[PDB]
């Protein structure tokens, strides 16, 4: 069991604001094969090129305003537990 409650609250929540989440996996596999039997070869030049990976974030401008106004919280009964009995809240004004 999982219970979450909010009454009259204010939240500002951000995950990785500026640059975000970046995940890069670089795993090329090379299985080239040169074979010779009973013959003649010249020179071998094995010169394969590597990859380029680039991730960039240049000129970001992020601006937030959060405002909350409540006149009054009063006379609240909040029972997220179980098996309770005879819970009371009273208010009187003259």
Residue numbers in the entry: 254 to 274, 306 to 378
The authors write:
Filamentous Tau inclusions are a defining feature of several neurodegenerative diseases, including Alzheimer’s disease (AD), Pick’s disease and progressive supranuclear palsy (PSP). Six Tau isoforms that range from 352 to 441 amino acids are expressed in adult human brains and are produced by alternative mRNA splicing of MAPT, the Tau gene. Inclusion of exon 10 results in the production of three Tau isoforms with 4 repeats (4R), and its exclusion in another three isoforms with 3 repeats (3R). In Pick’s disease, only 3R Tau is present in the disease filaments, with the Pick fold being extended and two-layered.
Mutation ∆K281 (previously called ∆K280) in exon 10 of MAPT reduces exon 10 inclusion by abolishing a splicing enhancer element, resulting in the relative overproduction of wild-type 3R Tau. We used cryo-EM to image Tau filaments that were extracted from temporal and frontal cortex of two cases with ∆K281 mutation. Filament structures were determined to a resolution of 2.6 Å, which was sufficient for atomic modelling. The core of Tau filaments from cases with the ∆K281 mutation comprised the 21 C-terminal amino acids of R1, the whole of R3 and R4, as well as 10 amino acids after R4, but lacked residues V275-S305 of R2. The extended and two-layered filament core is identical to the Pick fold, comprising 9 β-strands. Protofilaments extended from residues K254 to F378 of 3R Tau. Identical filament folds were present in grey matter of temporal cortex from case 1 and grey and white matter of frontal cortex from case 2. NPFs consisting of a single protofilament predominated. Unlike in other diseases with abundant Tau inclusions, TMEM106B filaments were not observed. We now show that mutation ∆K281 in MAPT causes an inherited form of Pick’s disease, indicating that relative overproduction of 3R Tau is sufficient to give rise to the Pick fold.
